[PDB]
């Protein structure tokens, strides 16, 4: 039985300009006091064609974690557009939230993210190079993909 159980994730500030930080409200239960810290990450998939364009937006060690119900808003800055291939800037991509305990990832929450221009003129006549100051991010929040992994809790 997992010592930490994630019960809910709420996507905040959605939709938003591409440049706004990500904000997720996470609710989790800790069945018993943990001796070490929990490692939370937000990873942006810059390109569905290659893992080389993944950006770790935030990686944080939070603890000690006592037994009980916990709730926190986890914020990360938007990805660096200078590392995103132009062909991947408009369309669907992925953002992941992971939690790790003692070097072992035990949960991954993934969301599809649709990136499109907010103005109609730009959607129909997109600039040759993407203008990230005009892109809107729409995280598909009603469809999280939750994957849990078996780890040694000690």
């Amino acid at each position: 039985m997992a010592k930490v159980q994630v019960n809910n994730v709420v996507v905040l500030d959605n939709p938003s300009p591409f440049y706004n930080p990500f904000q997720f409200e996470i609710t989790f239960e800790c069945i018993e006091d943990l001796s070490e810290d929990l490692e939370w990450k937000i990873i942006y998939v810059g390109s569905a064609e290659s893992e080389e364009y993944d950006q770790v937006l935030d990686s944080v060690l939070v603890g000690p974690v006592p037994a009980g119900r916990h709730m926190f808003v986890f914020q990360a800055d938007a990805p660096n557009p200078g590392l995103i291939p132009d062909a991947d800037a408009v369309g669907v991509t992925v953002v992941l939230i992971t939690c790790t305990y003692r070097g072992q990832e035990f949960i991954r929450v993934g969301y599809y993210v649709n990136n499109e221009y907010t103005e109609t003129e730009l959607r129909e006549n997109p600039p040759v190079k993407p203008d990230f100051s005009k892109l809107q991010r729409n995280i598909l929040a009603s469809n999280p993909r939750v994957t849990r992994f078996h780890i040694n809790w000690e």
Binding site: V45, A48, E51, V92, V94, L96, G110, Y111, Y112, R145
Partner: peptide
């Protein structure tokens, strides 16, 4: 299975 098996 194509890698949308990251999510």
């Amino acid at each position: 299975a194509a890698x949308x098996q990251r999510i």
